[PDB]
Amino acid sequence: ATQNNPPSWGLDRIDQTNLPLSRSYTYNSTGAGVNAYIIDTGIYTAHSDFGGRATNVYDALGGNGQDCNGHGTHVAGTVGGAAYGVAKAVNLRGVRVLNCSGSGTTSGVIAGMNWVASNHVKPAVANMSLGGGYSSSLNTAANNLASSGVFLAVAAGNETTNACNRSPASAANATTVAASTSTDARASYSNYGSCVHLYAPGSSITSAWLNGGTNTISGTSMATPHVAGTAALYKATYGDASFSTIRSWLVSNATSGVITGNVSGTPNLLLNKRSL
Ligand SMILES: [Ca+2]
CATH number of the domain residue 197 falls in: 3.40.50.200
Q: How far apart are CA 121 and CA 181, in angstroms?
A: 34
- Cβ atoms within 10 Å, residue 256: 14
Distance 170 CA to ligand 1 centre (A): 31
Q: CA-CA distance, 71 to 77, in Å (whole number)?
A: 10
Domain membership of residue 275 (yes or no) is no
Q: Does 169 map to a domain?
A: yes
Q: What residues does 198 pair with on adjacent strands?
A: 177
276 in a structural domain: no
226 is catalytic: no
Residue at 147: amino acid letter: S
Pairwise CA distance, residues 119 & 133, whole Å: 27
Active site residue 264: no
Domain around 197? 2-270
What spacing in Å lies between the alpha carbon of 27 and ligand 1's midpoint? 10
For the four alpha carbons of 185, 178, 155 and 188, in that order, the dihedral sign comes to negative
Asked about 101 being catalytic, the answer comes back as no
Distance set, CA 236 to CA 34, 55, 96, 139, 146 (Å): 6, 20, 25, 28, 18
Q: Are 267 and 177 in contact (CB under 8 A)?
A: no
Q: Is 188 annotated as a binding residue?
A: no
Name the experimental technique.
X-ray
The response to whether 59 counts as a known ligand-binding position is: no
Q: How far apart are CA 22 and CA 83, in angstroms?
A: 16
Ligand 1 centre from 77 Cα, in Å?
18
Compute how many other C-beta atoms are within 10 angstroms of the C-beta atom of residue 160. 12
Task: Report the separation in Å between the CA atom of 272 and the middle of ligand 1, taken as the mean of its atom positions.
Answer: 10
Residue 206, in any domain of the structure:
yes
| Cα of 269 vs its chain's centroid, Å | 16
Rounded CA gap, 16 and 14, in Å?
6
Q: Is 3 annotated as contributing to ligand binding?
A: no
DSSP notation for 127-171: EE---EE--HHHHHHHHHHHHTTEEEEEE--SSSSBGGGEETTT-
Q: Please tell me whether 22 is known to bind a ligand.
A: yes
CA distance 192 to 215: 26
- Say how many Å lie between the CA of residue 9 and the centre of ligand 1: 8
What is the 197 CA–ligand 1 centroid distance (Å)? 22
Given 3-state DSSP classes, what are the helix, strand and coil percentages for the chain, each rounded to the nearest 5?
30, 25, 45
- Domain assignment of residue 181, yes or no: yes
- Considering 47, 71, 120, 197, which one is annotated as catalytic? 71
**Rounded Cα–Cα distance for residues 216 and 116 (Å):** 28
SS3 58: strand
d(CA 199, CA 27): 20
Domain count, the chain: 1
Distances (CA, A) of 226 to 108, 155, 168, 207: 24, 11, 18, 12
Q: Are 173 and 142 in contact (CB under 8 A)?
A: yes
Among residues 40, 49, 67, 184, the one annotated as catalytic is 40
